[PDB]
Design a protein around this ligand. Structure first.
Ligand SMILES: CC(=O)Nc1nnc(S(N)(=O)=O)s1
Ligand SMILES: [Zn+2]
Length: 258
């Protein structure tokens, strides 16, 4: 089974999922010199209801804050999107050390971590499962985290880490102000890509914010104390869970800003 360890890591993924070498894989390196502004891009419209969050858990590959997507209370619209995309989950990627943990990298630079807000096209498809199999089915908002002062908006999440240390563990997580976690500026880059974890489906319209948010070194270290293994099973820490940048393959990276 896949993972981020030496024997089941990203370089080995093509062995289980041939699509790992697809033409629209994520993440990628964003080279600002090659980015083209597109006036046809609309401003992002983000409406998040704090009552949407339901639970947080350890999937074995990251922590997952799952939201109730039966309702249309939390949705993402605008940007490069056509229609409304319902909020589904929030998770985080990091590396074994502060100097290299983000999935997407900018001009050869890796941030310390990267937050992903996963949405699906509820306007066209019946469920996230089916949307995940369509080119225009998913939209993932990426937020870079860079080392800085402690971020009090992460406390709610970090306080639960011990209760979901083991893979499979979960605890109730509600009344979460996701919006306040985003940077003040929503300027972003967008390109067609895929999920960064198996099944690596190429159904994602990526929206990566340019402005990063802060996290202290102490805070980030807590996520590395999570295990990618289950209780009663041989232990292994989830010290790193980011996929290396993938070949752009001629895709166009667009900027919503000048
Ligand atoms: C259930 C679900 O959301 N699966 C995902 N797989 N990859 C994702 S990511 N890292 O590309 O946002 S989300
Ligand atoms: Zn992710």
């Amino acid at each position: 089974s896949w993972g981020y360890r030496e024997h089941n890591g990203p370089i080995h993924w093509k062995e289980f999922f041939p699509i790992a070498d697809g033409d629209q894989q994520s993440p990628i390196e964003i080279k600002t010199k090659e980015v083209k502004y597109d006036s046809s891009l609309r401003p992002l419209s983000i409406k998040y209801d704090p009552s949407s969050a339901k639970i947080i858990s350890n999937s074995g590959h990251s922590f997952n804050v799952d939201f109730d997507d039966t309702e249309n209370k939390s949705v993402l619209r605008g940007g490069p999107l056509t229609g409304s995309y319902r909020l589904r989950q929030v998770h985080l990627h990091w590396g074994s050390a502060d100097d290299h943990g983000s999935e997407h990298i900018v001009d050869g630079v890796s941030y310390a971590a990267e937050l992903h807000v996963v949405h699906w096209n509820s306007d066209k498809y019946p469920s996230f499962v089916e949307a995940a199999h369509e080119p225009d089915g998913l939209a993932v908002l990426g937020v870079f985290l860079q080392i800085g002062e402690p971020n009090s908006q992460l406390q709610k999440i970090t306080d639960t880490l011990d209760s979901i240390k083991e893979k499979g563990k979960q605890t109730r997580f509600t009344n979460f102000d996701l919006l306040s976690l985003l940077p003040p500026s929503w300027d972003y880059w967008t390109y067609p890509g895929s999920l960064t974890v198996p099944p690596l489906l190429e159904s994602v319209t990526w929206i990566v914010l340019k402005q990063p948010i802060n996290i202290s070194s102490q805070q980030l270290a807590k996520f590395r104390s999570l295990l990618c293994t289950a209780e009663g099973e041989a232990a292994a820490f989830l010290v790193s869970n980011h996929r290396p940048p993938q070949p752009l393959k001629g895709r166009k990276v667009r900027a919503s800003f000048h």
